[PDB]
């Protein structure tokens, strides 16, 4: 009942906060900007001093904060990274491990992001959860801010929950987004700016792509949008629209701009009418500040947002994702869970469209991103692909034969490669 | 108003019935036993006479009926197979084509079985549909019998619907399973036994395997069982359970036996309480006869039955499917459809998806546990729940790549664990 008394009792230093984490246990943390830099530096220091060991850390969407501290290659023998998604940080480790006599240093845990809450809480189990939070409000609640995802579940299921208060973390309204002090085991404070998503340059091809994509977005569309230069530009094209909605996996600066412009009203959604729904947020300082106390933005846990069945309840969903390669069948590959939840959900939505877009080439036009056959596991299976788009147009693949697929996909390739690809298709018997 | 008058008006010969189908149009037909033999023979003949061309046929689960009629190789240029699953019949055509001068002769259409009704009705478009049906009842309705699937949907969407009345087709109750006479364009009669799935004999491993699986089936389970001896036999170890339910893609003999025995009450299901749900059926004459007018069996369309969200509604779902290979990561491969239930069972409260296979093939000489699947998979590794061989069961959910590989190598036959362990080390699955 005395919230200022509980806060003072629980408030401590980063060093002391992480000091009681058991060796040989399971720890998890928020995603990206949610990762708590002061707590993680102190924990990394505990390993450096040889005072903790055999600590498994299970997580998604790592940022420079985790990579610079606990995930640093030298602590790999004491803090074991159990990544459930592989980003730039793990790729760097993976390469280092290969060069060190094919040593294994990342313990990839295959999973569905939409199942993360259940996997972490039930099959795996998380003993300690750490997350950056907004400042306590006058009723005693902290907000997970940029993060909802699996965090709102694991913050509660973990045997200890440690928070890092940071005034740069927006106070976001959402389902289980708010956590009462009575539910927090320790508090440290570190007011420092949130980590930013790098702003990436627009290549020329995105212009034609954004216009091709934009023709495929109807009024009343309910947007889900990934990150990058391409989706931002698309958001740029949609500024003249009206009455759009948002139900997105990640909330990004392009989408927020449409909110700021009054383009997104959410009045045509079936679920969460009136509110922009997302499961975690990434962007730049201007966007992070804008989320603070916004009543028309509402974070929800990932097992809700990325449930394809939930997605489909909104009419006219448009899912826009990027990929690196598309093959002649055409399966798509985004590497070299998130996305796939929305491909399925958007197709299921009434009037819904799933769009996957890529420029037709890479490397100053020397490499085709339209290829004969993806190498190994794919991102988007060919049975799920709906609409693909390059600077040369768009194709809806649903119901097309293998031959019809190969022929139409080749026509989206750069002219320099159509002859080469046509030959490959006959050799593969796609014809 | 007068059904007897409408019937005689529409009744005709297979020849005349199919004589009007336009060249260059799209046709589809029921699955398996639903494939109308008289109508399809008559259609194949038009192609032989050279009286029809450029006809695309879109379908799933070919049966020797279509295999021996419209699908015969010599007609490939006139009746074009647009296959949405690839089974034994298409393999044979495809192999023959390669021998006929690297000629492309089968068109594969990638799809989700549970999207089949929409893909076919809306993306592809179907003009003529043909399906075997039970005899007209005294209210003027035929039944799709052993077929619902996408058949219920396309019978209505096609410009023309042609039925083959067969007294051997059971009269089955289900959603849209009954078709009024005013919804039918033409009728032919051909009373002949339905196609049977071959009965297959058990191999010894199924005995250990069935036990391991049985032990994973909780009180009041809601079953889906995959076609084949393995699932058929696990049904057998369940002769003793009580209050089981059925919500399955295919209704097979093993499941029907549990119904016959009173083991299945469906009283613990949340959806379709009291009724066994399936989307199409395959078995032998004894099972087909048993379905006739059964009030506790209810077919529903595949876009309902195979919707993972629907599957999950029922508590304690158990999905038992078989496969040919499991790799060390470990995805599964069923080829030389079911993914919906792998997803649905895991989502069910108390649900389990089980995929099982003997650990070896070729008299113990080939391991069915392999390092990495060659090409595209059936069940992806992020979706696999429980995998079973005669050496035990493992729940893969939440396991790391190392944890997956180590427990999986122990499910391989001992002759192979070392050879497999070394491959894993080389792949850095370690």
mmCIF file with all atom_site columns, N, CA and C in Angstrom, chain B residues 32-33 113 145-149 170 172-173 195 197 223-228 231-232 235 245-260 264 266 269 275-284 286-292 294 296-300 305-306 341:
data_model
loop_
_atom_site.group_PDB
_atom_site.id
_atom_site.type_symbol
_atom_site.label_atom_id
_atom_site.label_alt_id
_atom_site.label_comp_id
_atom_site.label_asym_id
_atom_site.label_entity_id
_atom_site.label_seq_id
_atom_site.pdbx_PDB_ins_code
_atom_site.Cartn_x
_atom_site.Cartn_y
_atom_site.Cartn_z
_atom_site.occupancy
_atom_site.B_iso_or_equiv
_atom_site.pdbx_formal_charge
_atom_site.auth_seq_id
_atom_site.auth_comp_id
_atom_site.auth_asym_id
_atom_site.auth_atom_id
_atom_site.pdbx_PDB_model_num
ATOM 1   N N  . UNK B 1 32  ? -10.404 -39.900 -53.670 1.00 0.00 ? 32  UNK B N  1
ATOM 2   C CA . UNK B 1 32  ? -10.384 -41.329 -53.425 1.00 0.00 ? 32  UNK B CA 1
ATOM 3   C C  . UNK B 1 32  ? -11.660 -42.060 -53.906 1.00 0.00 ? 32  UNK B C  1
ATOM 4   N N  . UNK B 1 33  ? -12.361 -42.686 -52.955 1.00 0.00 ? 33  UNK B N  1
ATOM 5   C CA . UNK B 1 33  ? -13.569 -43.476 -53.230 1.00 0.00 ? 33  UNK B CA 1
ATOM 6   C C  . UNK B 1 33  ? -14.671 -42.663 -53.901 1.00 0.00 ? 33  UNK B C  1
ATOM 7   N N  . UNK B 1 113 ? -3.975  -28.285 -48.007 1.00 0.00 ? 113 UNK B N  1
ATOM 8   C CA . UNK B 1 113 ? -5.213  -29.024 -48.111 1.00 0.00 ? 113 UNK B CA 1
ATOM 9   C C  . UNK B 1 113 ? -6.399  -28.243 -47.549 1.00 0.00 ? 113 UNK B C  1
ATOM 10  N N  . UNK B 1 145 ? -21.451 -38.752 -49.029 1.00 0.00 ? 145 UNK B N  1
ATOM 11  C CA . UNK B 1 145 ? -20.983 -39.997 -48.462 1.00 0.00 ? 145 UNK B CA 1
ATOM 12  C C  . UNK B 1 145 ? -19.621 -39.868 -47.780 1.00 0.00 ? 145 UNK B C  1
ATOM 13  N N  . UNK B 1 146 ? -18.634 -40.587 -48.327 1.00 0.00 ? 146 UNK B N  1
ATOM 14  C CA . UNK B 1 146 ? -17.274 -40.602 -47.777 1.00 0.00 ? 146 UNK B CA 1
ATOM 15  C C  . UNK B 1 146 ? -16.506 -39.321 -48.032 1.00 0.00 ? 146 UNK B C  1
ATOM 16  N N  . UNK B 1 147 ? -17.124 -38.397 -48.742 1.00 0.00 ? 147 UNK B N  1
ATOM 17  C CA . UNK B 1 147 ? -16.454 -37.164 -49.057 1.00 0.00 ? 147 UNK B CA 1
ATOM 18  C C  . UNK B 1 147 ? -17.169 -35.915 -48.643 1.00 0.00 ? 147 UNK B C  1
ATOM 19  N N  . UNK B 1 148 ? -16.399 -35.029 -48.034 1.00 0.00 ? 148 UNK B N  1
ATOM 20  C CA . UNK B 1 148 ? -16.839 -33.678 -47.703 1.00 0.00 ? 148 UNK B CA 1
ATOM 21  C C  . UNK B 1 148 ? -15.714 -32.798 -48.241 1.00 0.00 ? 148 UNK B C  1
ATOM 22  N N  . UNK B 1 149 ? -14.626 -32.643 -47.470 1.00 0.00 ? 149 UNK B N  1
ATOM 23  C CA . UNK B 1 149 ? -13.399 -31.958 -47.919 1.00 0.00 ? 149 UNK B CA 1
ATOM 24  C C  . UNK B 1 149 ? -13.705 -30.660 -48.626 1.00 0.00 ? 149 UNK B C  1
ATOM 25  N N  . UNK B 1 170 ? -22.194 -44.899 -48.746 1.00 0.00 ? 170 UNK B N  1
ATOM 26  C CA . UNK B 1 170 ? -23.052 -44.661 -47.584 1.00 0.00 ? 170 UNK B CA 1
ATOM 27  C C  . UNK B 1 170 ? -23.703 -43.288 -47.610 1.00 0.00 ? 170 UNK B C  1
ATOM 28  N N  . UNK B 1 172 ? -24.230 -40.331 -45.619 1.00 0.00 ? 172 UNK B N  1
ATOM 29  C CA . UNK B 1 172 ? -23.576 -39.723 -44.456 1.00 0.00 ? 172 UNK B CA 1
ATOM 30  C C  . UNK B 1 172 ? -24.072 -38.336 -44.074 1.00 0.00 ? 172 UNK B C  1
ATOM 31  N N  . UNK B 1 173 ? -24.235 -38.102 -42.774 1.00 0.00 ? 173 UNK B N  1
ATOM 32  C CA . UNK B 1 173 ? -24.652 -36.788 -42.362 1.00 0.00 ? 173 UNK B CA 1
ATOM 33  C C  . UNK B 1 173 ? -23.416 -35.902 -42.174 1.00 0.00 ? 173 UNK B C  1
ATOM 34  N N  . UNK B 1 195 ? -13.739 -48.197 -53.797 1.00 0.00 ? 195 UNK B N  1
ATOM 35  C CA . UNK B 1 195 ? -12.309 -48.533 -53.705 1.00 0.00 ? 195 UNK B CA 1
ATOM 36  C C  . UNK B 1 195 ? -11.808 -48.731 -52.295 1.00 0.00 ? 195 UNK B C  1
ATOM 37  N N  . UNK B 1 197 ? -8.784  -48.985 -49.338 1.00 0.00 ? 197 UNK B N  1
ATOM 38  C CA . UNK B 1 197 ? -7.380  -48.835 -49.074 1.00 0.00 ? 197 UNK B CA 1
ATOM 39  C C  . UNK B 1 197 ? -6.829  -50.227 -48.864 1.00 0.00 ? 197 UNK B C  1
ATOM 40  N N  . UNK B 1 223 ? -9.039  -37.622 -30.866 1.00 0.00 ? 223 UNK B N  1
ATOM 41  C CA . UNK B 1 223 ? -8.066  -38.203 -31.801 1.00 0.00 ? 223 UNK B CA 1
ATOM 42  C C  . UNK B 1 223 ? -8.108  -37.728 -33.233 1.00 0.00 ? 223 UNK B C  1
ATOM 43  N N  . UNK B 1 224 ? -6.928  -37.581 -33.835 1.00 0.00 ? 224 UNK B N  1
ATOM 44  C CA . UNK B 1 224 ? -6.874  -37.601 -35.281 1.00 0.00 ? 224 UNK B CA 1
ATOM 45  C C  . UNK B 1 224 ? -5.842  -38.711 -35.488 1.00 0.00 ? 224 UNK B C  1
ATOM 46  N N  . UNK B 1 225 ? -6.124  -39.607 -36.425 1.00 0.00 ? 225 UNK B N  1
ATOM 47  C CA . UNK B 1 225 ? -5.219  -40.678 -36.800 1.00 0.00 ? 225 UNK B CA 1
ATOM 48  C C  . UNK B 1 225 ? -4.864  -40.688 -38.265 1.00 0.00 ? 225 UNK B C  1
ATOM 49  N N  . UNK B 1 226 ? -3.578  -40.779 -38.589 1.00 0.00 ? 226 UNK B N  1
ATOM 50  C CA . UNK B 1 226 ? -3.145  -40.820 -39.972 1.00 0.00 ? 226 UNK B CA 1
ATOM 51  C C  . UNK B 1 226 ? -3.340  -42.196 -40.578 1.00 0.00 ? 226 UNK B C  1
ATOM 52  N N  . UNK B 1 227 ? -3.599  -42.237 -41.880 1.00 0.00 ? 227 UNK B N  1
ATOM 53  C CA . UNK B 1 227 ? -3.810  -43.499 -42.579 1.00 0.00 ? 227 UNK B CA 1
ATOM 54  C C  . UNK B 1 227 ? -2.539  -44.342 -42.597 1.00 0.00 ? 227 UNK B C  1
ATOM 55  N N  . UNK B 1 228 ? -2.701  -45.650 -42.425 1.00 0.00 ? 228 UNK B N  1
ATOM 56  C CA . UNK B 1 228 ? -1.573  -46.564 -42.423 1.00 0.00 ? 228 UNK B CA 1
ATOM 57  C C  . UNK B 1 228 ? -1.640  -47.571 -41.292 1.00 0.00 ? 228 UNK B C  1
ATOM 58  N N  . UNK B 1 231 ? -0.849  -46.249 -37.438 1.00 0.00 ? 231 UNK B N  1
ATOM 59  C CA . UNK B 1 231 ? -1.935  -45.597 -36.704 1.00 0.00 ? 231 UNK B CA 1
ATOM 60  C C  . UNK B 1 231 ? -3.103  -46.535 -36.443 1.00 0.00 ? 231 UNK B C  1
ATOM 61  N N  . UNK B 1 232 ? -3.324  -47.419 -37.397 1.00 0.00 ? 232 UNK B N  1
ATOM 62  C CA . UNK B 1 232 ? -4.369  -48.418 -37.298 1.00 0.00 ? 232 UNK B CA 1
ATOM 63  C C  . UNK B 1 232 ? -4.147  -49.310 -36.074 1.00 0.00 ? 232 UNK B C  1
ATOM 64  N N  . UNK B 1 235 ? -4.617  -47.658 -32.647 1.00 0.00 ? 235 UNK B N  1
ATOM 65  C CA . UNK B 1 235 ? -6.050  -47.636 -32.342 1.00 0.00 ? 235 UNK B CA 1
ATOM 66  C C  . UNK B 1 235 ? -6.380  -48.831 -31.463 1.00 0.00 ? 235 UNK B C  1
ATOM 67  N N  . UNK B 1 245 ? -12.671 -38.877 -28.160 1.00 0.00 ? 245 UNK B N  1
ATOM 68  C CA . UNK B 1 245 ? -13.352 -38.176 -29.235 1.00 0.00 ? 245 UNK B CA 1
ATOM 69  C C  . UNK B 1 245 ? -12.674 -38.366 -30.567 1.00 0.00 ? 245 UNK B C  1
ATOM 70  N N  . UNK B 1 246 ? -13.344 -37.969 -31.638 1.00 0.00 ? 246 UNK B N  1
ATOM 71  C CA . UNK B 1 246 ? -12.703 -37.989 -32.946 1.00 0.00 ? 246 UNK B CA 1
ATOM 72  C C  . UNK B 1 246 ? -12.899 -36.640 -33.644 1.00 0.00 ? 246 UNK B C  1
ATOM 73  N N  . UNK B 1 247 ? -11.785 -36.054 -34.056 1.00 0.00 ? 247 UNK B N  1
ATOM 74  C CA . UNK B 1 247 ? -11.794 -34.942 -34.973 1.00 0.00 ? 247 UNK B CA 1
ATOM 75  C C  . UNK B 1 247 ? -10.564 -35.190 -35.827 1.00 0.00 ? 247 UNK B C  1
ATOM 76  N N  . UNK B 1 248 ? -10.787 -35.784 -36.995 1.00 0.00 ? 248 UNK B N  1
ATOM 77  C CA . UNK B 1 248 ? -9.696  -36.316 -37.804 1.00 0.00 ? 248 UNK B CA 1
ATOM 78  C C  . UNK B 1 248 ? -9.847  -35.802 -39.224 1.00 0.00 ? 248 UNK B C  1
ATOM 79  N N  . UNK B 1 249 ? -8.759  -35.837 -39.982 1.00 0.00 ? 249 UNK B N  1
ATOM 80  C CA . UNK B 1 249 ? -8.810  -35.421 -41.382 1.00 0.00 ? 249 UNK B CA 1
ATOM 81  C C  . UNK B 1 249 ? -9.454  -36.591 -42.112 1.00 0.00 ? 249 UNK B C  1
ATOM 82  N N  . UNK B 1 250 ? -8.838  -37.769 -41.986 1.00 0.00 ? 250 UNK B N  1
ATOM 83  C CA . UNK B 1 250 ? -9.354  -38.984 -42.597 1.00 0.00 ? 250 UNK B CA 1
ATOM 84  C C  . UNK B 1 250 ? -9.971  -39.922 -41.575 1.00 0.00 ? 250 UNK B C  1
ATOM 85  N N  . UNK B 1 251 ? -11.176 -40.434 -41.850 1.00 0.00 ? 251 UNK B N  1
ATOM 86  C CA . UNK B 1 251 ? -11.800 -41.416 -40.958 1.00 0.00 ? 251 UNK B CA 1
ATOM 87  C C  . UNK B 1 251 ? -11.330 -42.718 -41.546 1.00 0.00 ? 251 UNK B C  1
ATOM 88  N N  . UNK B 1 252 ? -10.650 -43.513 -40.737 1.00 0.00 ? 252 UNK B N  1
ATOM 89  C CA . UNK B 1 252 ? -10.092 -44.768 -41.201 1.00 0.00 ? 252 UNK B CA 1
ATOM 90  C C  . UNK B 1 252 ? -10.651 -45.929 -40.414 1.00 0.00 ? 252 UNK B C  1
ATOM 91  N N  . UNK B 1 253 ? -10.318 -47.165 -40.812 1.00 0.00 ? 253 UNK B N  1
ATOM 92  C CA . UNK B 1 253 ? -10.901 -48.307 -40.094 1.00 0.00 ? 253 UNK B CA 1
ATOM 93  C C  . UNK B 1 253 ? -10.587 -48.354 -38.601 1.00 0.00 ? 253 UNK B C  1
ATOM 94  N N  . UNK B 1 254 ? -9.359  -48.001 -38.207 1.00 0.00 ? 254 UNK B N  1
ATOM 95  C CA . UNK B 1 254 ? -8.961  -48.068 -36.812 1.00 0.00 ? 254 UNK B CA 1
ATOM 96  C C  . UNK B 1 254 ? -9.829  -47.152 -35.975 1.00 0.00 ? 254 UNK B C  1
ATOM 97  N N  . UNK B 1 255 ? -10.089 -45.963 -36.484 1.00 0.00 ? 255 UNK B N  1
ATOM 98  C CA . UNK B 1 255 ? -10.949 -45.040 -35.768 1.00 0.00 ? 255 UNK B CA 1
ATOM 99  C C  . UNK B 1 255 ? -12.364 -45.561 -35.726 1.00 0.00 ? 255 UNK B C  1
ATOM 100 N N  . UNK B 1 256 ? -12.835 -46.137 -36.811 1.00 0.00 ? 256 UNK B N  1
ATOM 101 C CA . UNK B 1 256 ? -14.198 -46.606 -36.808 1.00 0.00 ? 256 UNK B CA 1
ATOM 102 C C  . UNK B 1 256 ? -14.389 -47.766 -35.875 1.00 0.00 ? 256 UNK B C  1
ATOM 103 N N  . UNK B 1 257 ? -13.369 -48.590 -35.725 1.00 0.00 ? 257 UNK B N  1
ATOM 104 C CA . UNK B 1 257 ? -13.448 -49.648 -34.730 1.00 0.00 ? 257 UNK B CA 1
ATOM 105 C C  . UNK B 1 257 ? -13.683 -49.126 -33.303 1.00 0.00 ? 257 UNK B C  1
ATOM 106 N N  . UNK B 1 258 ? -13.018 -48.036 -32.916 1.00 0.00 ? 258 UNK B N  1
ATOM 107 C CA . UNK B 1 258 ? -13.200 -47.450 -31.587 1.00 0.00 ? 258 UNK B CA 1
ATOM 108 C C  . UNK B 1 258 ? -14.619 -46.912 -31.440 1.00 0.00 ? 258 UNK B C  1
ATOM 109 N N  . UNK B 1 259 ? -15.183 -46.417 -32.536 1.00 0.00 ? 259 UNK B N  1
ATOM 110 C CA . UNK B 1 259 ? -16.576 -45.996 -32.531 1.00 0.00 ? 259 UNK B CA 1
ATOM 111 C C  . UNK B 1 259 ? -17.469 -47.213 -32.306 1.00 0.00 ? 259 UNK B C  1
ATOM 112 N N  . UNK B 1 260 ? -17.241 -48.273 -33.083 1.00 0.00 ? 260 UNK B N  1
ATOM 113 C CA . UNK B 1 260 ? -18.052 -49.488 -32.969 1.00 0.00 ? 260 UNK B CA 1
ATOM 114 C C  . UNK B 1 260 ? -17.999 -50.011 -31.524 1.00 0.00 ? 260 UNK B C  1
ATOM 115 N N  . UNK B 1 264 ? -15.271 -44.421 -28.222 1.00 0.00 ? 264 UNK B N  1
ATOM 116 C CA . UNK B 1 264 ? -15.424 -43.025 -28.615 1.00 0.00 ? 264 UNK B CA 1
ATOM 117 C C  . UNK B 1 264 ? -16.839 -42.536 -28.243 1.00 0.00 ? 264 UNK B C  1
ATOM 118 N N  . UNK B 1 266 ? -17.158 -38.910 -27.620 1.00 0.00 ? 266 UNK B N  1
ATOM 119 C CA . UNK B 1 266 ? -17.132 -37.510 -28.046 1.00 0.00 ? 266 UNK B CA 1
ATOM 120 C C  . UNK B 1 266 ? -17.729 -36.573 -27.035 1.00 0.00 ? 266 UNK B C  1
ATOM 121 N N  . UNK B 1 269 ? -15.434 -33.533 -26.050 1.00 0.00 ? 269 UNK B N  1
ATOM 122 C CA . UNK B 1 269 ? -15.103 -32.489 -27.027 1.00 0.00 ? 269 UNK B CA 1
ATOM 123 C C  . UNK B 1 269 ? -15.822 -31.182 -26.699 1.00 0.00 ? 269 UNK B C  1
ATOM 124 N N  . UNK B 1 275 ? -20.403 -36.135 -31.657 1.00 0.00 ? 275 UNK B N  1
ATOM 125 C CA . UNK B 1 275 ? -20.345 -36.546 -33.056 1.00 0.00 ? 275 UNK B CA 1
ATOM 126 C C  . UNK B 1 275 ? -18.882 -36.682 -33.416 1.00 0.00 ? 275 UNK B C  1
ATOM 127 N N  . UNK B 1 276 ? -18.557 -37.727 -34.160 1.00 0.00 ? 276 UNK B N  1
ATOM 128 C CA . UNK B 1 276 ? -17.197 -37.951 -34.644 1.00 0.00 ? 276 UNK B CA 1
ATOM 129 C C  . UNK B 1 276 ? -16.978 -37.144 -35.955 1.00 0.00 ? 276 UNK B C  1
ATOM 130 N N  . UNK B 1 277 ? -15.963 -36.296 -36.031 1.00 0.00 ? 277 UNK B N  1
ATOM 131 C CA . UNK B 1 277 ? -15.823 -35.419 -37.199 1.00 0.00 ? 277 UNK B CA 1
ATOM 132 C C  . UNK B 1 277 ? -14.671 -35.887 -38.101 1.00 0.00 ? 277 UNK B C  1
ATOM 133 N N  . UNK B 1 278 ? -14.896 -35.873 -39.411 1.00 0.00 ? 278 UNK B N  1
ATOM 134 C CA . UNK B 1 278 ? -13.850 -36.252 -40.342 1.00 0.00 ? 278 UNK B CA 1
ATOM 135 C C  . UNK B 1 278 ? -14.091 -35.419 -41.598 1.00 0.00 ? 278 UNK B C  1
ATOM 136 N N  . UNK B 1 279 ? -13.109 -35.320 -42.482 1.00 0.00 ? 279 UNK B N  1
ATOM 137 C CA . UNK B 1 279 ? -13.339 -34.589 -43.719 1.00 0.00 ? 279 UNK B CA 1
ATOM 138 C C  . UNK B 1 279 ? -13.443 -35.443 -45.001 1.00 0.00 ? 279 UNK B C  1
ATOM 139 N N  . UNK B 1 280 ? -12.784 -36.591 -45.012 1.00 0.00 ? 280 UNK B N  1
ATOM 140 C CA . UNK B 1 280 ? -13.097 -37.622 -45.993 1.00 0.00 ? 280 UNK B CA 1
ATOM 141 C C  . UNK B 1 280 ? -12.702 -38.966 -45.407 1.00 0.00 ? 280 UNK B C  1
ATOM 142 N N  . UNK B 1 281 ? -13.207 -40.058 -45.975 1.00 0.00 ? 281 UNK B N  1
ATOM 143 C CA . UNK B 1 281 ? -12.967 -41.392 -45.417 1.00 0.00 ? 281 UNK B CA 1
ATOM 144 C C  . UNK B 1 281 ? -12.389 -42.389 -46.423 1.00 0.00 ? 281 UNK B C  1
ATOM 145 N N  . UNK B 1 282 ? -11.485 -43.221 -45.903 1.00 0.00 ? 282 UNK B N  1
ATOM 146 C CA . UNK B 1 282 ? -10.908 -44.332 -46.643 1.00 0.00 ? 282 UNK B CA 1
ATOM 147 C C  . UNK B 1 282 ? -10.820 -45.574 -45.766 1.00 0.00 ? 282 UNK B C  1
ATOM 148 N N  . UNK B 1 283 ? -11.171 -46.726 -46.328 1.00 0.00 ? 283 UNK B N  1
ATOM 149 C CA . UNK B 1 283 ? -11.100 -47.988 -45.603 1.00 0.00 ? 283 UNK B CA 1
ATOM 150 C C  . UNK B 1 283 ? -11.487 -49.188 -46.456 1.00 0.00 ? 283 UNK B C  1
ATOM 151 N N  . UNK B 1 284 ? -12.184 -50.176 -45.882 1.00 0.00 ? 284 UNK B N  1
ATOM 152 C CA . UNK B 1 284 ? -12.628 -51.323 -46.670 1.00 0.00 ? 284 UNK B CA 1
ATOM 153 C C  . UNK B 1 284 ? -14.137 -51.436 -46.636 1.00 0.00 ? 284 UNK B C  1
ATOM 154 N N  . UNK B 1 286 ? -16.218 -53.141 -45.098 1.00 0.00 ? 286 UNK B N  1
ATOM 155 C CA . UNK B 1 286 ? -16.893 -53.206 -43.787 1.00 0.00 ? 286 UNK B CA 1
ATOM 156 C C  . UNK B 1 286 ? -17.112 -51.821 -43.159 1.00 0.00 ? 286 UNK B C  1
ATOM 157 N N  . UNK B 1 287 ? -16.101 -50.965 -43.275 1.00 0.00 ? 287 UNK B N  1
ATOM 158 C CA . UNK B 1 287 ? -16.184 -49.618 -42.749 1.00 0.00 ? 287 UNK B CA 1
ATOM 159 C C  . UNK B 1 287 ? -17.179 -48.767 -43.536 1.00 0.00 ? 287 UNK B C  1
ATOM 160 N N  . UNK B 1 288 ? -17.123 -48.823 -44.866 1.00 0.00 ? 288 UNK B N  1
ATOM 161 C CA . UNK B 1 288 ? -18.016 -48.010 -45.707 1.00 0.00 ? 288 UNK B CA 1
ATOM 162 C C  . UNK B 1 288 ? -19.486 -48.345 -45.404 1.00 0.00 ? 288 UNK B C  1
ATOM 163 N N  . UNK B 1 289 ? -19.778 -49.633 -45.215 1.00 0.00 ? 289 UNK B N  1
ATOM 164 C CA . UNK B 1 289 ? -21.135 -50.083 -44.959 1.00 0.00 ? 289 UNK B CA 1
ATOM 165 C C  . UNK B 1 289 ? -21.572 -49.515 -43.611 1.00 0.00 ? 289 UNK B C  1
ATOM 166 N N  . UNK B 1 290 ? -20.639 -49.508 -42.666 1.00 0.00 ? 290 UNK B N  1
ATOM 167 C CA . UNK B 1 290 ? -20.921 -49.054 -41.307 1.00 0.00 ? 290 UNK B CA 1
ATOM 168 C C  . UNK B 1 290 ? -21.281 -47.569 -41.210 1.00 0.00 ? 290 UNK B C  1
ATOM 169 N N  . UNK B 1 291 ? -20.778 -46.741 -42.115 1.00 0.00 ? 291 UNK B N  1
ATOM 170 C CA . UNK B 1 291 ? -21.061 -45.302 -42.065 1.00 0.00 ? 291 UNK B CA 1
ATOM 171 C C  . UNK B 1 291 ? -22.502 -44.951 -42.416 1.00 0.00 ? 291 UNK B C  1
ATOM 172 N N  . UNK B 1 292 ? -23.175 -45.824 -43.165 1.00 0.00 ? 292 UNK B N  1
ATOM 173 C CA . UNK B 1 292 ? -24.528 -45.549 -43.664 1.00 0.00 ? 292 UNK B CA 1
ATOM 174 C C  . UNK B 1 292 ? -25.517 -45.160 -42.538 1.00 0.00 ? 292 UNK B C  1
ATOM 175 N N  . UNK B 1 294 ? -25.380 -43.365 -39.930 1.00 0.00 ? 294 UNK B N  1
ATOM 176 C CA . UNK B 1 294 ? -24.885 -43.336 -38.557 1.00 0.00 ? 294 UNK B CA 1
ATOM 177 C C  . UNK B 1 294 ? -25.060 -41.937 -37.938 1.00 0.00 ? 294 UNK B C  1
ATOM 178 N N  . UNK B 1 296 ? -24.052 -40.560 -35.135 1.00 0.00 ? 296 UNK B N  1
ATOM 179 C CA . UNK B 1 296 ? -22.956 -40.046 -34.331 1.00 0.00 ? 296 UNK B CA 1
ATOM 180 C C  . UNK B 1 296 ? -21.648 -39.868 -35.135 1.00 0.00 ? 296 UNK B C  1
ATOM 181 N N  . UNK B 1 297 ? -21.779 -39.843 -36.462 1.00 0.00 ? 297 UNK B N  1
ATOM 182 C CA . UNK B 1 297 ? -20.660 -39.512 -37.339 1.00 0.00 ? 297 UNK B CA 1
ATOM 183 C C  . UNK B 1 297 ? -21.099 -38.308 -38.146 1.00 0.00 ? 297 UNK B C  1
ATOM 184 N N  . UNK B 1 298 ? -20.207 -37.359 -38.386 1.00 0.00 ? 298 UNK B N  1
ATOM 185 C CA . UNK B 1 298 ? -20.592 -36.114 -39.038 1.00 0.00 ? 298 UNK B CA 1
ATOM 186 C C  . UNK B 1 298 ? -19.446 -35.556 -39.892 1.00 0.00 ? 298 UNK B C  1
ATOM 187 N N  . UNK B 1 299 ? -19.564 -35.601 -41.219 1.00 0.00 ? 299 UNK B N  1
ATOM 188 C CA . UNK B 1 299 ? -18.482 -35.051 -42.039 1.00 0.00 ? 299 UNK B CA 1
ATOM 189 C C  . UNK B 1 299 ? -18.561 -33.526 -42.036 1.00 0.00 ? 299 UNK B C  1
ATOM 190 N N  . UNK B 1 300 ? -17.403 -32.872 -42.142 1.00 0.00 ? 300 UNK B N  1
ATOM 191 C CA . UNK B 1 300 ? -17.372 -31.434 -42.285 1.00 0.00 ? 300 UNK B CA 1
ATOM 192 C C  . UNK B 1 300 ? -16.319 -31.082 -43.315 1.00 0.00 ? 300 UNK B C  1
ATOM 193 N N  . UNK B 1 305 ? -12.343 -28.675 -40.671 1.00 0.00 ? 305 UNK B N  1
ATOM 194 C CA . UNK B 1 305 ? -11.677 -29.776 -39.985 1.00 0.00 ? 305 UNK B CA 1
ATOM 195 C C  . UNK B 1 305 ? -10.170 -29.491 -39.855 1.00 0.00 ? 305 UNK B C  1
ATOM 196 N N  . UNK B 1 306 ? -9.533  -28.952 -40.897 1.00 0.00 ? 306 UNK B N  1
ATOM 197 C CA . UNK B 1 306 ? -8.075  -28.785 -40.876 1.00 0.00 ? 306 UNK B CA 1
ATOM 198 C C  . UNK B 1 306 ? -7.603  -27.390 -40.494 1.00 0.00 ? 306 UNK B C  1
ATOM 199 N N  . UNK B 1 341 ? -2.628  -30.472 -38.317 1.00 0.00 ? 341 UNK B N  1
ATOM 200 C CA . UNK B 1 341 ? -2.837  -31.147 -37.041 1.00 0.00 ? 341 UNK B CA 1
ATOM 201 C C  . UNK B 1 341 ? -1.606  -31.099 -36.134 1.00 0.00 ? 341 UNK B C  1
#
